[PDB]
Design an enzyme around this catalytic site. Structure first.
Site, PDB file in Angstrom:
ATOM      1  N   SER A  27       0.857  -1.191   0.000  1.00  0.00           N
ATOM      2  CA  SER A  27       0.000   0.000   0.000  1.00  0.00           C
ATOM      3  C   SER A  27       0.890   1.236   0.000  1.00  0.00           C
ATOM      4  O   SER A  27       1.697   1.391  -0.934  1.00  0.00           O
ATOM      5  CB  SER A  27      -0.982  -0.105   1.164  1.00  0.00           C
ATOM      6  OG  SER A  27      -2.153   0.646   0.900  1.00  0.00           O
ATOM      7  N   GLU A  41      -9.239  -5.264  -4.401  1.00  0.00           N
ATOM      8  CA  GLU A  41      -8.469  -4.163  -3.832  1.00  0.00           C
ATOM      9  C   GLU A  41      -9.359  -3.086  -3.224  1.00  0.00           C
ATOM     10  O   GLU A  41      -8.935  -2.393  -2.291  1.00  0.00           O
ATOM     11  CB  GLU A  41      -7.566  -3.550  -4.903  1.00  0.00           C
ATOM     12  CG  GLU A  41      -6.364  -4.404  -5.269  1.00  0.00           C
ATOM     13  CD  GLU A  41      -5.242  -4.290  -4.256  1.00  0.00           C
ATOM     14  OE1 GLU A  41      -5.352  -3.461  -3.330  1.00  0.00           O
ATOM     15  OE2 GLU A  41      -4.248  -5.035  -4.385  1.00  0.00           O
ATOM     16  N   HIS A  45      -7.826  -5.450   0.561  1.00  0.00           N
ATOM     17  CA  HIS A  45      -6.538  -4.770   0.571  1.00  0.00           C
ATOM     18  C   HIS A  45      -5.765  -5.092   1.845  1.00  0.00           C
ATOM     19  O   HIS A  45      -6.248  -4.842   2.954  1.00  0.00           O
ATOM     20  CB  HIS A  45      -6.780  -3.267   0.447  1.00  0.00           C
ATOM     21  CG  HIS A  45      -5.538  -2.453   0.280  1.00  0.00           C
ATOM     22  ND1 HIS A  45      -4.758  -2.507  -0.856  1.00  0.00           N
ATOM     23  CD2 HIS A  45      -4.954  -1.543   1.094  1.00  0.00           C
ATOM     24  CE1 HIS A  45      -3.741  -1.674  -0.728  1.00  0.00           C
ATOM     25  NE2 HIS A  45      -3.839  -1.076   0.446  1.00  0.00           N
TER      26      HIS A  45
END
Ligand code: A1CD5
Ligand code: A1CD5
EC number: 3.1.1.7
Lengths: 540, 540
Positions: free
Chosen positions: B200, B331, B444
């Site tokens: 990330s 995601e 995610h």
């Protein structure tokens, strides 16, 4: 002496001819005059009904073809010659034809009325692929087909003027529909059950008759094959039609150098020119290089069309109406060899990326560069952005979706969601005798031979499976003409054809295999054309 | 006393701790100071190296977490609290950790350097899911992980000024990389084989180190998991960073009315406020309601980033660089619960179309109404335009593609086409112990626990197949760290992982099944974001 070949109509007496099919004879009356010859001072004017005649008018052969451009790109090529005129050209061409079974029906029989296509610039009811003898013999219906003025003679428009109002070619069709109301009973046809059906520009014409009040009461059902009145090619704007008419006048020397150019003096000079001279400059009037664009088409003027087609389809109530619509599998492939770079009917047309990007500007003319980028985004396989075969099929989809599939899908949904019972199809069989190259697939216009039962002709090399397939389609089309439903009334055994609704959006595939139900008339691609691209062009 | 738990570095001596794993012990040195505590006058300033110390610094436990927002929207929930700080908060937080195998390697060993994510506003190297004992044990590599300043303390920027230059959190990471270069040999690590990897905002950080010359010489390989520096959330302009810094100052009473004014008086006032006061107003400076947008992120000042990440990616020579890159299956689903209307982690989130259309404005903030229409066009199934389940997965794709998948695919292709060896993956296994709802799929951040071998922890309830799967991934990541190639250096029995090229676009799916090669990282959707939408925004 067979007394079934003599018929009296409101204008006089006729002599027909007997046509033979492998299943029996059929009575035909070819070349019935339904209008005064629109020549001399009548050029560009609405038709007038044919005055009654003495004696017996001979109706044993097709009459003259309306003056039109003749395709000469491929001399001797069956793929193009089959659409070219097969009778001599003349402005005296407003004649219709009636097929009726033998023996003549004693009880009133539903009527099929054919309107040929040809981009509003060409076409004739005398073409071999419109031979109604097999449809009438196999299904015992009454078939009527008419000639209507094409090109400048049918659609040159100086709007607001009295000498060239426009849409007179559509009025020729309306007069032929009024003729059927008054005389089809004499042939054993039911004037309370006539079903319009046409292809391409004829399908567009059928659509404009739904949206015209004076024509709507002359028929009861409609069939639109690979065409719709809302297509980007089927209509033209007021000011653009005036520009094209003035540009045709200039190319042929009207007005003469020194005189004024109001609407009266322009048409007067146009009427003194030989008809072939006007035809010889028809294509030199389009505003830019393109495919699937035609010079003289129906004009939105407020008369025949009180508003644009798209506006009337949205604001229309269609209760009590049954419609059959459909497309072929490869609507756009035929037009790519008529202007798209890198395309040729005699090679594989494996175009390059640069040729695809240039072809998009030809296939989608008069759009912003940003609008073209949106088309390229939607129609590019970004995993194979340079594969020639995929680019060839993509540009064909671009032209076919933009011009046929998406205008038809929009019309079918609006009709079903506003009263009409709609049935949809996709024709997916490529004729075994097709002369166009293999990469074209099932091109625009090559379902007509199977609708009219041409494979039954013993002088042709169609396969036995195509003969059975042709009879299936003729039953579909006749069942819709009789009952408003293509499905067999006395048969739950055969696979069923569900109606097309705005939600489920069901259609069937027409091919040698049994009926197969699918959902979505290219729903993803048509959302781009019907929903997003207008919003894009508004913000320009 | 173990002789291996005593290690001397350039600043002084350390005492480590032995960590138990089911396969053997591991030496850990947790809490090594690598910078002077950035407190008082040093707030918002670049880090200075840690002064040398006398005596033995205790490195047996993690140090403090940098000041950051704490997620409280779901108290007691494991899915959110696993990312929350697990040590006390303090501005005295610039400490790193070193894991090394037992016995200490005698030959230099490749080094993995972890950079945690958290939207540049949160995160800590002490989180349980970043426990490096299982990776170092199974693959006998050296693992380093550092803390870096997040939020305003790391990325508040008044560009051009000396008191708050911005990007100091990225300089925190660079200083830790300089520390690894100077001291990782003392732990048996090879400073010539340093592989960065993060997730990330950590993956975005790894990308910005590839694009920063002063950082490029500190590592040799890179792994970017679910993040890229060119993402719409990873950077901000100078004018916007100044606006956010000024609004935060205003919200905490800076400047005192009425004094002004310039950057010196503003930052000086900010330094007097307690750290928690600054944290309590961090989210109240975002320009609009949104998801996947963060207040204080790396700024394009001109120093750390000489140009935008997009510009440097295109004009960069990446020869001699190996990159591992990838995303998770879903995601965007994690972020919809944080602002998208109709979404809740405790129900099915079967949203309506009205909620979908509104959610597009939250998932794609600060775009024209026409741009939103284009997003809706691409992500609507027009056969089922109102199906709640399809709309839920569509909005998740909108957020995931816009923020992660397409920025990653854009970077991966331009890296491979410009000299870099690239491998791509898509993580498709949902952990059996996942506490988030089922409709979120593989959200995610939930490949991290498998990369770090957390399923090997006997105190957890992972399945036997997940344990084997975790070892497979650790070998993949370690092989890439050692050789630059995730494939086994000799073993041909296992399926091959082909490099990702700009043309073939090959990636593999990571799950319980053997490797499966696929082509295209959502190629159609990412052409909309990476190619068309920018052209749409230029013509407003
Ligand atoms: O079937 C279609 C659809 N085209 O989109 N077109 C057939 C008619 C052929 N013309 C194409 C347009 C150009 C014109 C120039 C030939 N001499 C003047 C020939
Ligand atoms: O994971 C994400 C991605 N968001 O896009 N966010 C986690 C943090 C959640 N904030 C949402 C905005 C509102 C704020 C509440 C604090 N106001 C008082 C918390």
């Amino acid at each position: 002496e067979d007394a079934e070949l003599l018929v009296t109509v409101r204008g006089g007496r006729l002599r027909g001819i007997r046509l033979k099919t492998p299943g029996g004879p059929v009575s035909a009356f070819l070349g019935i005059p339904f209008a005064e010859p629109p020549m001399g001072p009548r050029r560009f004017l609405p038709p007038e009904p044919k005055q009654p005649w003495s004696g017996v008018v001979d109706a044993t052969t097709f009459q003259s073809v309306c003056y039109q451009y003749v395709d000469t790109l491929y001399p001797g090529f069956e793929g193009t010659e089959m659409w070219n005129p097969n009778r001599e050209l003349s402005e005296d061409c407003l004649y219709l034809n009636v097929w009726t079974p033998y023996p003549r029906p004693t009880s009133p029989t539903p009527v099929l009325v054919w309107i040929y296509g040809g981009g509003f610039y060409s076409g004739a009811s005398s073409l071999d692929v419109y031979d109604g003898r097999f449809l009438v013999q196999a299904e015992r219906t009454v078939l009527v087909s008419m000639n209507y003025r094409v090109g400048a003679f049918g659609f040159l428009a100086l709007p607001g003027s009295r000498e060239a109002p426009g849409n007179v070619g559509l009025l020729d069709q309306r007069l032929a529909l009024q003729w059927v109301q008054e005389n089809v009973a004499a042939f054993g046809g039911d004037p309370t059950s006539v079903t319009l059906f046409g292809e391409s520009a004829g399908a567009a014409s059928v659509g404009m008759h739904l949206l015209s009040p004076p024509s709507r009461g002359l028929f009861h059902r409609a069939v639109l094959q690979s065409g719709a009145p809302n297509g980007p090619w089927a209509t033209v704007g007021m000011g653009e039609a005036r520009r094209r008419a003035t540009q045709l006048a200039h190319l042929v020397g009207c007005p003469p150098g020194g005189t004024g150019g109001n609407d009266t003096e322009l048409v007067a000079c146009l009427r003194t020119r030989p008809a072939q001279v006007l035809v010889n400059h028809e294509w030199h009037v389009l505003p830019q290089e393109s495919v699937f664009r035609f010079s003289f088409v129906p004009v939105v003027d407020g008369d025949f069309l009180s508003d644009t087609p798209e506006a009337l389809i949205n604001a229309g109530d269609f209760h009590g109406l049954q419609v059959l619509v459909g497309v072929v599998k490869d609507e756009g492939s035929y037009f790519l060899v008529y202007g798209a770079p890198g395309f040729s009917k005699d090679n594989e047309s494996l175009i390059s990326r640069a040729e695809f990007l240039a072809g998009v500007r030809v296939g989608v003319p008069q759009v912003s560069d940003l609008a073209a980028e949106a088309v390229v985004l939607h129609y590019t396989d970004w995993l194979h952005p340079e594969d020639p075969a995929r680019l060839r099929e993509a540009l064909s989809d671009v032209v076919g979706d933009h011009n046929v599939v998406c205008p038809v899908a929009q019309l079918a949904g609006r009709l079903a969601a506003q009263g009409a019972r709609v049935y949809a199809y996709v024709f997916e069989h490529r004729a075994s005798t097709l002369s166009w190259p293999l990469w074209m697939g099932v091109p625009h216009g090559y379902e007509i031979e199977f609708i009219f039962g041409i494979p039954l002709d013993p002088s042709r090399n169609y396969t036995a499976e195509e003969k059975i397939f042709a009879q299936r389609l003729m039953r579909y089309w006749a069942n819709f003409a009789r009952t408003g439903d293509p499905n067999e009334p006395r048969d739950p055994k055969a696979p069923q054809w569900p109606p097309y609704t705005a939600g489920a959006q069901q259609y069937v595939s027409l091919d040698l295999r049994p009926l197969e139900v699918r959902r979505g008339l290219r729903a993803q691609a048509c959302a781009f054309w019907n929903r997003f691209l207008p919003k894009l062009l508004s913000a320009t």
